[PDB]
Design a protein around this ligand. Structure first.
Ligand SMILES: C[C@H](CCC(=O)NCCC[N+](C)(C)CCCS(=O)(=O)[O-])[C@H]1CC[C@H]2[C@@H]3[C@H](O)C[C@@H]4C[C@H](O)CC[C@]4(C)[C@H]3C[C@H](O)[C@]12C
Ligand SMILES: Nc1ncnc2c1ncn2[C@@H]1O[C@H](COP(=O)(O)OP(=O)(O)O)[C@@H](O)[C@H]1O
Ligand SMILES: Nc1ncnc2c1ncn2[C@@H]1O[C@H](COP(=O)(O)OP(=O)(O)O)[C@@H](O)[C@H]1O
Ligand SMILES: [Ho]
Ligand SMILES: [Ho]
Ligand SMILES: [Ho]
Ligand SMILES: [Ho]
Lengths: 376, 376
């Protein structure tokens, strides 16, 4: 069996064997998860390897490499370069981005990252367009669907984002002071029917190759640079999903802040939708293969559908990150405790509003303005 | 080793039937040029084989065999039994149904087939449910999507049903007397935008394993029996598609008839929707895996979505069959010529109305009553 877990030594040996170094090197394992090692080798390099836990298939490393390379074809400046990949060893050798900070960390420290939304909006519009039926011959697209089928990672999302938070399930994790509001959600038939439909779309709508986990902890940032990483959840899913999960995580950071310190984030939500729409639209007009593409009003109705699902998926992400298994540092580190519970209540209520009202919003401004009203 | 595909003849077809262990006479009775259908007698047997030669791979035989077997697990009384299949030779050995008549032929001859809609409604509700995410564990369903990926047959449909009739494309085929009305369709931006969305759903909504070409020429019928055949177009697609294609073909036959003779067809349109809804609903109650399934109103909204798409897909089928490459004998055999033109103009008009107004109908009766008024 060809798979063997690497260490700092064999990681160095792999790097030299690839001719990526002469080589005089030091290696430190710097990963923060329990299912991947990330080896930093210092010119520098990163080698990421999936571990079986021996649980989750090491096949996600094939998806991740393939996803990163595909993203690199259209937005090379917004993803790490890949130098080597191997499915059997479950390895991706890629560009070192140690000079950057994970965006969630920076944002909690109070960095504002002026270009974050412009860069992520571009990432969203080009990646989501160029792997769609709008951009690709349909027989080609259908092969990519097979190639990026991701049953085990999709299973995590289907459960965590779309199901468990809405019921009294074992995976949930919330303070007992939130229970009155949590049980309010559980008893809300109409929001749950809506969460069901959004889930159905997640299950069935193979529109493009999505990132599948595009939150602020999956992005590197500094003043001038942005890089998206860790596309292990990539599969063919709804266009609105990456847009919505990103947006929710900007709202999650706003909720961790107070007063006028929230404005940079509200500005990020506006600018990211704006940039997504502009970017998707330029691509659509330049590169669409569809005979229907140029019919007046078709791009518009298409964007309206993506906008609506995006808001619904943001609602689920807001709710999921508050009371489910996998939380965010933005909410969990708010102090004092009573203030934390207050803001977590607001994440629940705004997420609910987003799900229920998603088709009523006409612009991103309506979304921002409604959120601001609720969180006053 | 070597390539194993070889075209069968009447002799080698008999030799295979005996080698399988299943004094004989053989006649090839196929009506297309892409398949041979060998009838073997004395008890009887059918052997279908794909021909390589619209050039089309023999891979469709693999789809068809596996689609037939899957349909048979839930509705064995509504599909021919499969005794043997082989992907390399591209053969399906199946139950003889020569005591039955192709439904389109029988309907044009004036057969009414009292149970046709009862039987097709059940086929529709059970096949479409039990292969969906509602019925299957999502990891299981996702592998069935790979297995029934059908790029070439889908390409036919995406072109013929959803694209070509709506523009001045070379595949179209209509009398020059229809041109004023045909060009009216081509210039209709708002209906084309809706055809585009219906297509997008065909391209992207992997909800269930559908038959993909369920018209009246794909069904065997007698007074007491119904059998669905030729699921070569099978893939993971929108639930409403089979429902809508079938419905459109009942309306196509109605248009070929006059006056009081149309009523058994209108009753079939009503009964097939009713029975589909009943059958799908019973299945939903008894066999859903979804925690969301029994939330009051969710089955209802789900059926409303299927109903809407089904009417829009019916619109496309009505138009497609009238002016596209592949016509229907119901319309093309209408006499005299001017009557044929009149009825073909109405198929275009009702199809357009179906596409445009699909979300405004509340019941199947609404659909039947609008059709009746348009074809007075
Ligand atoms: C006039 C007959 C009544 C038959 C009867 O009484 N037999 C019926 C029953 C169903 C009705 C249509 C649907 O409602 C959808 C739609 C609703 C809009 O509002 C107005 C237009 C439209 C096309 C309706 C027109 C008309 O109203 C219909 C054909
Ligand atoms: N290309 C890289 N350059 C520098 N550090 C990286 C790089 N990729 C990952 N890391 C570090 O390792 C951590 C975990 O990486 P990630 O790809 O998210 O692994 P996991 O999928 O296990 O979460 C990141 O937060 C980051 O600090
Ligand atoms: N199981 C069967 N029993 C009896 N006749 C059959 C059977 N299957 C097909 N046929 C006959 O052969 C014709 C062609 O079958 P079909 O499966 O529709 O092939 P094609 O894909 O080439 O149209 C049918 O219209 C029918 O007359
Ligand atoms: Ho990560
Ligand atoms: Ho990851
Ligand atoms: Ho056929
Ligand atoms: Ho066929």
């Amino acid at each position: 069996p060809l798979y063997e877990t690497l260490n700092e030594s064999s990681a160095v040996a792999l790097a030299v064997k690839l001719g990526l170094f002469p080589s005089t090197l030091t290696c430190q394992e710097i990963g923060d998860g329990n299912l991947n090692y990330v080896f930093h080798i210092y010119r520098a390099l990163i080698i990421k390897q999936a571990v079986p836990y021996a649980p989750l298939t090491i096949d996600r490393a094939r998806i991740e490499s393939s996803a990163l390379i595909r993203q690199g074809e259209h937005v090379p400046h917004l993803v790490p370069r890949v130098f080597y990949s191997d499915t059997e060893m479950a390895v991706t050798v890629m560009e070192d981005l140690s000079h950057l900070k994970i965006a969630r960390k920076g944002l909690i420290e109070g960095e504002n990252y002026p270009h974050l939304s412009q860069h992520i909006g571009e990432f969203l519009g080009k990646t989501l367009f160029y792997s769609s039926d709008y951009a690709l011959e349909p027989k080609v697209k259908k092969q990519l669907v097979k190639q990026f089928t991701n049953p085990e990672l999709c299973d995590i999302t289907e459960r965590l984002v779309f199901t468990d938070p809405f019921f009294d399930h074992d995976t949930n994790d919330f303070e007992e002071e939130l229970r009155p509001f949590v049980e309010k959600l559980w008893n809300n038939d109409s929001v749950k029917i809506e969460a069901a439909k959004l889930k159905k779309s997640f299950l069935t709508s193979a529109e493009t190759l999505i990132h599948g986990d595009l939150h602020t902890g999956s992005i590197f940032a500094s003043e001038h640079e942005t890089k998206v990483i860790d596309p292990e959840f990539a599969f063919y899913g709804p266009i609105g999903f990456d847009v919505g999960q990103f947006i929710a995580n900007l709202f999650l950071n706003a909720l961790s802040r107070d007063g006028a310190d929230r404005e940079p984030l509200y500005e990020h939500v506006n600018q990211v939708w704006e940039t997504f729409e502009e970017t998707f639209s330029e691509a659509w007009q330049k590169d669409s293969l569809d005979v229907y593409a140029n019919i007046d009003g078709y791009l518009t109705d298409t964007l309206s559908h993506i906008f609506e699902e995006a808001i619904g998926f943001a609602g689920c992400e807001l709710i999921r990150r508050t009371i489910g298994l996998a939380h965010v540092a933005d909410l969990d580190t708010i102090v004092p405790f009573d203030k934390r519970i207050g803001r977590k209540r607001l994440a629940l209520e705004t997420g609910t509003a987003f799900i229920e009202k998603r088709s009523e919003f006409k612009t991103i401004t309506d979304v921002i303005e409604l959120f601001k009203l609720l969180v006053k």
